[PDB]
């Protein structure tokens, strides 16, 4: 079910956005959309909203967080009434 | 003055709700940098609210929003 | 097919965001997501991304642009 | 002075170099990108809405540069 992955990454790191986008189109999760803002000169905050099973999400998190330049990849997950 | 995301799911039919949050956030003295809304279905929205301020005002905004009639879910993510 | 509605609205106007949300859930179009930023003290910029047929989109535009406080609602459409 | 605009792009993310090139064009641009939202339409198509801010010439120009790129399928500018 539905979740948000909050990522903070470098900015100065190159081909990182390209590699993140690559991962998401690849992922078995359905990534509804991602928003990015500029945190400061050196840092970027990106909020990914996705749907899927708990393995596919957990995997997509380890994948992104594993990229070099991704400083931080926390995950919020919600299930139901 | 740190940054955090606030993930909320709520029923948009609880009238008063949406505007009340807008009011709580203006009051807050945390600035909402930007926000992304997803209309999940007839009765459920997901907002991700990227915001910035002192860590007490952020702690508080969650405290306030989470308890509102019509808010089903509200988790805060600190950038630290 | 896919499109984006860029809306600039008041901010000081009340129950406007609540009325916008209401419309979209309502719309026959499928609204994928909407992002808002603060433009200044008095103005808000909201970018709605939606999928649907050209009548449903054209309707959703007129509906939103009609609301009081919506200063401006341009539309981008792609085949 | 310094106006605001949204730039809607559709592009193929498999054209490697493309994404990074746009990041570069925008840094150079001397328009500051306030924020941006990306939707993965399918295997080969992304839609970015890029909210940005700067002098109307630099904006004009960013469209002009981005629109022409190998891999960009669509690029329309909306002035505020
Ligand atoms: Ni506000
Ligand atoms: Ni909604
Ligand atoms: Ni940048
Ligand atoms: Ni994409």
From Swiss-Prot, chain B:
Cofactor: Ni(2+)
MF terms (GO), sorted A to Z: DNA binding; DNA-binding transcription repressor activity; identical protein binding; nickel cation binding; sequence-specific DNA binding; transcription cis-regulatory region binding
Positions contributing to Ni(2+) binding: 26, 37, 39, 45
UniProt keyword terms in alphabetical order: DNA-binding, Metal-binding, Nickel, Transcription, Transcription regulation
Cysteines joined through disulfide linkages: none
UniProt keyword annotation of DNA repair present: no
GO biological process: negative regulation of DNA-templated transcription; regulation of DNA-templated transcription; response to nickel cation
GO CC terms: protein-DNA complex
Annotated cofactor note: Binds 1 nickel ion per subunit.
Known role: Transcriptional regulator.
Family label: Belongs to the transcriptional regulatory CopG/NikR family.
Complex and partners: Homotetramer.
Name of the molecule in the record: Putative nickel-responsive regulator
Organism: Helicobacter pylori (strain ATCC 700392 / 26695) (Campylobacter pylori)
Stretch of the intact protein here: 63 to 142 of 148
From Swiss-Prot, chain C:
Cofactors, names only: Ni(2+)
Phylogenetic lineage: Bacteria, Pseudomonadati, Campylobacterota, Epsilonproteobacteria, Campylobacterales
Protein purpose: Transcriptional regulator.
Record: residues binding Ni(2+): 25, 36, 38, 44
Subunit structure, interactors included: Homotetramer.
Keyword DNA-binding: yes
GO biological process: negative regulation of DNA-templated transcription; regulation of DNA-templated transcription; response to nickel cation
Record key words, sorted: DNA-binding, Metal-binding, Nickel, Transcription, Transcription regulation
Family: Belongs to the transcriptional regulatory CopG/NikR family.
Cofactor: record remark: Binds 1 nickel ion per subunit.
Molecular function GO labels: DNA binding; DNA-binding transcription repressor activity; identical protein binding; nickel cation binding; sequence-specific DNA binding; transcription cis-regulatory region binding
The protein's name in its UniProt record: Putative nickel-responsive regulator
One GO term describing the cellular component: protein-DNA complex
UniProtKB/Swiss-Prot annotation, chain D:
BP-aspect Gene Ontology terms: negative regulation of DNA-templated transcription; regulation of DNA-templated transcription; response to nickel cation
Binding site for Ni(2+): 27, 38, 40, 46
Top-level taxon of the source organism: Bacteria
Keyword terms: DNA-binding, Metal-binding, Nickel, Transcription, Transcription regulation
Cofactor binding, per record: Binds 1 nickel ion per subunit.
MF terms in GO: DNA binding; DNA-binding transcription repressor activity; identical protein binding; nickel cation binding; sequence-specific DNA binding; transcription cis-regulatory region binding
One GO cellular component term noted in the UniProt record for this chain: protein-DNA complex
Cofactor annotation: Ni(2+)
Signal peptide positions (record): none
Record-stated family: Belongs to the transcriptional regulatory CopG/NikR family.
Record text on subunit structure and interactions: Homotetramer.
Protein purpose: Transcriptional regulator.
Protein name, UniProt field: Putative nickel-responsive regulator
